[model samples]
Target: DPRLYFENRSKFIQDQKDKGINPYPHKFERTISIPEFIEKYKDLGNGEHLEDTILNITGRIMRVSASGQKLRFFDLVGDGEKIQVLANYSFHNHEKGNFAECYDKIRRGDIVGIVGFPGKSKKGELSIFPKETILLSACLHMLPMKYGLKDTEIRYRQRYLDLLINESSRHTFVTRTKIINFLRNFLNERGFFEVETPMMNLIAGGANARPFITHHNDLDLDLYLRIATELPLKMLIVGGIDKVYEIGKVFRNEGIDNTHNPEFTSCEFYWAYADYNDLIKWSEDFFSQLVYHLFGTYKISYNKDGPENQPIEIDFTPPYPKVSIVEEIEKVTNTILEQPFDSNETIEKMINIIKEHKIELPNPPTAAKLLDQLASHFIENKYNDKPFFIVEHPQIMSPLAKYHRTKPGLTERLEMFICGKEVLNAYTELNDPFKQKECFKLQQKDREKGDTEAAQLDSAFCTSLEYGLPPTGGLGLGIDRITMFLTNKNSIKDVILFPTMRPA
Candidate 1:
């Protein structure tokens, strides 16, 4: 049936050409957006028609309806707004004979230009009575009209159609844009300069994530897509840029899920002469300002579907509670860390503690992963009602973080969590070249022990550290995840326009 519809639409397109009408025109002048049009005429009362005013509008036709043989109505949609266009044959003063024929050719999904006078219909609907119409572009295939593109695969693969049919998806992307724009403006006002770093790098040494590898044929070398913008941005900080940030794409060769995507947008920033504690205070201010600017309130309702389709309220007020990673683990697992975390006895004890929970072993089965799993189960799950930060991670878990000033065998790092999801990671950067080399050596040992997610020993980075990076604070925020939270979307794909999908 769809094939027949496509054939018929193709023939109709040819018929339009045979009648000397362009199915796809060069361009049409659109004077006003749909929002502008609606706002300009909002005060017009029911049945208060603009008889002499000629209005020009263009949008994709979403629905077509015929009334008897003289009147037809079309729902034209643009920018998430819809307007009714009434094609009455009586109003076609110029090219009157082509009115009915042209109306017959117009279908759903076709972009059309309408010249009309604004008015209210008999049923009190705001409408445009069209005197002339032109086909700007014609869609040959019939759109999914039965249930309106409910298939997730089809929606992701054919994102254009998804946006055309689903207003919520369009709104999510618009909100994403607004959030990013506001972030840029906010940082700029705070004297943070936005910068770009190379996406392809000689070595993937940023975060502990496996990188997407590619070969450079011209140079006859192997390169990797960056896993994070951490190292290069810090290099800029070493070069005396006081405050810098970059929002861009990073690739990871990882699994796909509701939260994980192979390629995603992330924002990373570094501020010279700041510590992790300062970053925590800055985050509170940043999130509070962002929420107030976007929604005009600190408390916003989110996750309408809840754990099983119930809504939860998130308050973005300042000074979210801070919890220590070790303390939470001790509270949840009933285990004491009297020994240093990196000590062999302590690691084996923690691993054995996690094994008691009867959960499957995490990949690599390392101390970091074991503690992380404990935090996810015991701490993160318990704090789903509000936003908080988990601070003072073990030294082994944070290869690039500065050693805590007072706490032995722990790093000055903080990960913010909201609704049991890790929203942000920030830390006081490791600037001492000698200490950084020791950290790199540990990472190299992990890599040698088959931890594929371990950061590489970037000797060049160590050399750069010798040039003296300041006591900088660095932060990375997942743009997609943030967009998901801001839009109250359950899946990452809902916020991403064209999420990666398996081949059909």
Candidate 2:
């Protein structure tokens, strides 16, 4: 069925080549952009008044209307808008020559550069009356229909075609840039230095996610695509640089889903001399201001199918609610802890809840993976009753956070969840080398258990921590996921350009 169109067009293309018309040209340059020309001559030209003024434009020919020995109209896209083009028998070249051959060779998907004078039809749309038409490229593929490729799977996977033909898709990426620029300006205004950390690391840590591994031939060693930029960024804090942030890609060798991508952008920052409690207030101020600056409002109608597919109002109006992770679990499950649940009990409880809820996991999972399941399942989806800072994670669960001063078994970490997604994760940096080394060893056991998510025991990092890194605050926000929220895209993949796909 699909080959029918291409098969017909192939014979048509052969006819033109036989007639000695080169359908593809080497070069064409437009004197101005479509928008610039519109602004300059919109008032000067009226009712065929500027018929002799020639203009050159280059774009994709997406539509056509023609007759024998003549051509009436075609549509081409220059910038984001479509402008109509007209070629008629009035041309000197058309009377005794190859105008019909050129028109015959013209196909819907071809790229063409035209020299024409701007005009307006009776319908009042902008028109370019062509004096000369040159083919730029012969397109050999059939585009999806006017509406789009109806199959969502193919559409997302072959998004380059969609972007080439669709205006809305173009707008989505444009909106993406606007959001990024606004964020950069916001951070730069507040004296935060933007920096880049290595994408490959000797060990993967920061968050509990496995990494895609790569081998370095020169060094004869294996390195991982950094799972998260958290650990090394904090190492800079140990070196006494006050404030720094990075917006970059992180790789996770894991399952593909609506919310999860193999590689995505993460914006992480570390600030000096602040605890999780202090960071919470700053986060509220930072995000509330950032959203308002970008969207002209901070109130989110996030009730529309929150990530766990439930409806509840999440008014990002700040001074968000706060609760400890264990306390929040107890509030929802109505189960009280008899004694402080050790790491093993915490992990076991996570498994029990997942089993009770019929939550799916990939065969077997680690303690951290099990905890991630609980967070995404119970706490995140149900918390839509209000916006809240989930504070006081089990100390063992947070390797880079300081211990809560007053709460003995809790680490100083708070994650902000609104639309059933943890938009922000922050912590008071764990500066005590002794306690950090203890946490490192416990995590190293997971590494031994084939947990690729475990942190590498970097002796150099430990030495830096021992050199008196201040008690500091760190924050990491999933940039792609946040873009999903701000742009109202249903999937994180839709917000990212060129999302990873299975190689054919």
Candidate 3:
């Protein structure tokens, strides 16, 4: 059926060429956007026309309704704005413009240009009466039927089609750009310089995620896609850049899920002379400001499908509660910690507790994995009705995190979880070269013991630390996850423009 339909459209393309019309034109002057056009003419009364005005507009034909042989009605969508257009033969008088012929040639999904006068219908609906219409580009393949393309798998694989058919998908991406813009300006005003960093690293030392490996043929060496921007950003801080940030792509060899993707976007920044405490306070303000920027209010509705979807006002007003990871786990699961959290005996005790509660342990059963599973089950999931910080994570959980001054065997790190998803990770940098090297060596031991997710030992980074790095605070926010939360999308794929897919 697709083959037959495609062939018909192919013939239509040639027919336009036979009539001396270019299916693909070089350009058209879009004098005004659809929204601007509507806003400028909103005061025009019904049955009133701005006859002296002429404008050029361009959009894709979303719907074509044939009203007899002499006239047709079309809805054109441009830049997430829709407007009604009518192609009437009376306007052209069947002369050289041949309005009827042009209207017949246009179909759904075709990009078209319209020169028209703005007016409103008798029923008070805004409408455009076009004097001329031209096919800017032809749709060579058939589109999915109306109400089709709703399948999640199909939508992810063919995102362009999804955007064409679904307004929500388009809005999600538009909101994503708006959010990024706000973030850039927010940081820029605070004296943070946006910079770029190397995407391929000699050693994946930033975070404890498996790297996607590649090879450089000319250098005859293996390289890895960066898992995080922490180490290099701190190196910049060491190089005398007081405040720096990067919003870029990161690749990881990980599983696909509602929130996880192999390749994703992240924002990381390092600030000199600042600690994790400053980051926590700044984040609350940033989030609240972002909501006001997008929705004009601090209160918003997320995940609005079920009966529990009533709009809950998030104050985001300061003094949000902070809970320690280990203590929160104890309170939720009623299990007391004995001594060291990273020890074999302690990790085994935690794993047995998880099993007794019918929780699944990740493969390889590393201490980090066990602790993360416990937190996800007992801590992160329960405390996510609103934004909250889980602070003072175990030192083993953060290899590059500074040791906490007040808490033994824990690091100065905090993560923000909203709606059961971790949106941000922040910590104080481990500036002591000796302690940093020790952390790397422990990671190397873990790697030798077949913990493939362990971070690599990068002596060069430690060597850079010896060059007198400053005490810095750093953070990483998942751009896709943040987009999902702000846009009320539950799946990361919905926010991502084009997600990774298996071979066709």
> How does each model score on TM-score?
0.96, 0.89, 0.94
* Model 3 segments more than 4 A misplaced: 97-99, 304-315
Backbone atom clashes (below 3 Å) for every candidate: 2, 0, 0
Winner on TM-score between 1 and 3 is 1
Model 3 agreement with the true structure over 258-308: per-residue lDDT tens digits = 899899999999989999899898888888898889998876677634335
Please give, for residues 116-192, the per-residue lDDT of candidate 1 as tens digits.
Answer: 88887777777888888888988888877636776447778888887887777888899999989988888888899
Best by lDDT: 1
Order candidates by TM-score, high to low: 1, 3, 2
CA RMSD for every model?
1.7, 3.3, 2.2
> lDDT of all predictions, in order shown?
0.85, 0.75, 0.84
Off by over 4 Å in 2: 1-22, 41-48, 67-71, 91-97, 146-148, 300-303, 306-314, 338-340, 343-371, 383-387, 446-452
Superposed on all Cα atoms, model 2 deviates from the true structure by an RMSD in Å of 3.3
